[PDB]
């Protein structure tokens, strides 16, 4: 198990992708670094040929799982590092439901002190007005400033006494940790400041202040003691039901109670949603499932990605993966396990080329009972 030595600290990363999707050719270069002790990746990608013809999110999985955090009890199962520095070949087919597919072949290996991921991608059969080539997928979840339908929500005053009325509302309705934030109201703009809340507790506070009549935006100045993926925020439409919303955002109405619970105690029952109300849509988690493929000396994985569609819905991307070592030295062939991935996409306001900034955390784990 030599290869783990190479990952004990911060390691620079080069990524190069040459892609052609339905004859639309493009290239991507990536620079940054990974820290496998923390399963952490910090990378920025640039479309070097111009504008990217597909949504950036659809390329994330293709654009170095040797940087996954494998805890001590899991190191027996870390195929990815055991193949270093000679590396591995990583191949996938990605089936976008009701649309085209990507086929990818990548070489992942050290070149000097740098871990390099060189990729060839070919996409075919996509609908030129589909969600992919039509650029209908949301890039990321809005940060920092959240917008609400200004005149929707609880009526706390007619048209610091305003911020006082808000704080009393948060308290009276039972919003957890309302006593750990400070509210400021400036002409339809609320600023919420606080420290050491959960991601979930923060989100419930933000939504409860925004769902007040006369509040058009909420400035999230709240630090979470600990990150974690944010939820989607959904604006209720005339005619909506929680069941129909669930069908759109998750794919089935049978997850409607997931939305209801995630918006308690602000929301008292499924029938009390109203047009213009913002609701938290908690992530439906997807894991990466890995298995060994010994008579090929590597591993297989399967998983799916949920890509949010901008104007409502989810585009599923089914992934099937095979990894084969490049070197002939023995490698670790793991037991069945899974990886848990948290990813955040952002933009450099000063960058002018088509790009993607990526922050990612990945951890390994053993298959659970509920699985
Ligand atoms: K409002």
């Amino acid at each position: 198990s030599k290869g783990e030595e190479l990952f004990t600290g911060v390691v620079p990363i080069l990524v190069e992708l040459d892609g052609d999707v339905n004859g639309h050719k493009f290239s991507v270069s990536g620079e940054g670094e990974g820290d496998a002790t923390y399963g952490k990746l910090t990378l920025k990608f640039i479309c070097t040929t111009g504008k990217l013809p597909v949504p950036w999110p659809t390329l994330v999985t293709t654009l170095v799982q040797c940087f996954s955090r494998y805890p001590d009890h899991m190191k027996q199962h870390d195929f990815f590092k055991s193949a270093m520095p000679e590396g591995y070949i990583q191949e996938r087919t990605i089936f976008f439901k009701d649309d085209g597919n990507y086929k990818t072949r990548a070489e992942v290996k050290f070149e000097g002190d740098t871990l390099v991921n060189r990729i060839e991608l070919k996409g075919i059969d996509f609908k030129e007005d589909g969600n992919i080539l039509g650029h209908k997928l949301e890039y990321n979840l809005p940060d920092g400033l959240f917008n609400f339908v200004k005149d929707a929500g609880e009526k706390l005053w007619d048209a610091d006494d305003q911020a006082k009325k808000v704080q009393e509302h948060l308290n009276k309705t039972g919003i957890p940790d309302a006593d750990k934030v400070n509210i400021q109201i400036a002409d339809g703009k609320a600023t919420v400041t606080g420290d050491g809340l959960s991601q979930e507790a923060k989100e419930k506070i933000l939504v409860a202040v925004g769902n007040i009549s006369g509040i058009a935006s909420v400035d999230d100045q709240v630090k979470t003691a600990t990150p974690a993926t944010a939820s989607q925020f959904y604006t209720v439409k005339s005619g909506d039901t929680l069941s129909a919303i669930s069908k759109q955002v998750y794919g089935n109405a049978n997850l409607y109670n997931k939305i209801f619970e995630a918006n308690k105690p602000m929301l008292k029952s499924p029938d009390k949603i109203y047009p213009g109300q913002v609701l938290r849509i908690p992530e439906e988690l997807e894991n990466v499932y890995i298995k060994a493929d010994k008579q090929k000396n590597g591993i297989k994985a399967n998983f799916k990605i949920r890509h949010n569609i901008e104007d409502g819905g989810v585009q599923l991307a089914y992934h099937y993966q095979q990894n084969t070592p490049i070197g002939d030295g023995p490698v670790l062939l793991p037991d069945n396990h899974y990886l848990s991935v948290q990813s955040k996409l952002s933009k450099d306001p000063n960058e002018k080329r088509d790009h993607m900034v990526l922050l990612e955390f990945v951890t390994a784990a053993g298959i659970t009972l509920g699985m």
Side-chain angles (χ1 to χ4, degrees), residues 1 3-371:
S1 325
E4 320 168 13
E5 49 186 66
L6 303 179
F7 293 92
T8 50
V10 177
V11 173
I13 301 171
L14 177 62
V15 183
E16 288 180 349
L17 169 65
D18 284 320
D20 167 18
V21 173
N22 270 5
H24 301 80
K25 287 160 173 315
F26 57 104
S27 283
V28 179
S29 78
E31 305 173 344
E33 57 183 50
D35 193 337
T37 59
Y38 295 142
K40 181 198 191 197
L41 291 175
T42 60
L43 286 157
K44 167 173 170 188
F45 301 93
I46 288 164
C47 187
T48 63
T49 49
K51 153 168 183 105
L52 193 64
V54 299
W56 277 114
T58 63
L59 293 187
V60 168
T61 57
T62 300
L63 293 167
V64 288
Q65 297 174 313
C66 48
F67 291 107
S68 303
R69 184 172 94 254
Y70 272 83
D72 58 305
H73 63 286
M74 300 297 280
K75 302 299 307 147
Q76 29 185 332
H77 312 307
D78 188 338
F79 162 85
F80 305 106
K81 303 185 179 60
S82 92
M84 292 308 159
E86 305 94 313
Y88 49 83
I89 304 289
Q90 182 162 295
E91 302 175 276
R92 288 203 187 104
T93 303
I94 302 177
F95 302 102
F96 296 84
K97 186 175 182 200
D98 299 325
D99 211 331
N101 61 95
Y102 294 163
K103 274 173 157 114
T104 65
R105 191 189 183 265
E107 276 163 32
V108 183
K109 62 195 254 275
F110 275 88
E111 302 183 346
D113 66 354
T114 296
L115 192 286
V116 174
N117 179 27
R118 280 201 191 79
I119 306 140
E120 302 183 77
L121 185 150
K122 180 181 177 93
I124 67 187
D125 297 336
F126 288 91
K127 303 169 186 168
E128 299 273 348
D129 44 42
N131 285 310
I132 287 50
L133 291 166
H135 293 90
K136 297 201 200 159
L137 307 183
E138 195 193 40
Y139 174 80
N140 63 346
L141 288 199
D143 214 84
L145 277 153
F146 303 95
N147 276 324
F148 299 75
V149 173
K150 178 168 176 162
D151 59 335
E154 188 77 18
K155 191 179 132 181
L156 295 183
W157 54 71
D158 251 357
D160 278 294
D161 175 57
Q162 264 183 352
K164 185 189 155 292
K165 297 244 201 310
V166 170
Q167 183 77 59
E168 284 171 38
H169 181 68
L170 292 186
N171 290 337
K172 178 194 159 318
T173 61
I175 307 285
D177 297 324
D179 55 13
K180 288 185 191 350
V181 301
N182 159 252
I183 315 283
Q184 313 174 238
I185 307 289
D187 213 358
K189 191 216 222 214
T191 302
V192 185
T193 315
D195 224 312
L197 289 82
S198 60
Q199 181 68 20
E200 164 178 343
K202 176 175 89 180
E203 294 184 351
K204 297 192 168 177
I205 289 157
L206 305 177
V207 173
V209 316
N211 285 336
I212 294 162
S213 202
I215 304 300
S217 60
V218 179
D219 191 349
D220 170 14
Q221 294 301 317
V222 180
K223 180 209 303 160
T224 53
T226 322
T229 307
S231 310
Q232 307 166 50
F233 285 7
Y234 176 83
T235 306
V236 176
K237 312 181 195 119
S238 169
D240 278 347
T241 66
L242 279 193
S243 301
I245 295 163
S246 176
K247 178 171 170 165
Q248 174 169 87
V249 301
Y250 296 131
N252 198 295
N254 72 8
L255 289 170
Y256 87 85
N257 191 70
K258 187 178 167 79
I259 300 173
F260 172 32
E261 294 257 30
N263 290 279
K264 302 181 166 184
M266 171 189 82
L267 178 59
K268 301 230 74 173
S269 53
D271 57 286
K272 298 295 181 236
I273 70 176
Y274 53 93
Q277 184 182 28
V278 169
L279 306 169
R280 300 180 64 229
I281 306 296
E283 205 190 345
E284 178 69 1
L285 295 176
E286 295 293 343
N287 291 314
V288 174
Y289 300 95
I290 300 176
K291 78 187 179 120
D293 188 3
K294 299 161 93 108
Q295 270 298 56
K296 205 148 147 34
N297 202 213
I299 60 176
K300 290 198 135 74
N302 66 103
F303 53 101
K304 68 187 127 81
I305 300 294
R306 292 160 174 272
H307 294 303
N308 288 159
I309 305 169
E310 256 150 4
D311 292 329
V314 47
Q315 170 69 64
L316 296 169
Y318 296 88
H319 289 59
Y320 301 93
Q321 176 183 329
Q322 32 192 31
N323 293 53
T324 306
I326 295 178
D328 40 30
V331 288
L332 303 188
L333 299 194
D335 292 337
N336 288 7
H337 64 289
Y338 76 97
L339 306 175
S340 165
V341 183
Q342 301 79 37
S343 100
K344 181 174 204 336
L345 284 67
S346 61
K347 296 285 196 193
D348 190 338
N350 300 118
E351 176 63 56
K352 315 106 179 204
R353 311 160 273 203
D354 207 354
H355 69 287
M356 166 171 73
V357 181
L358 187 63
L359 178 62
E360 203 176 279
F361 300 90
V362 180
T363 310
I367 300 302
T368 67
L369 219 47
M371 293 171 183

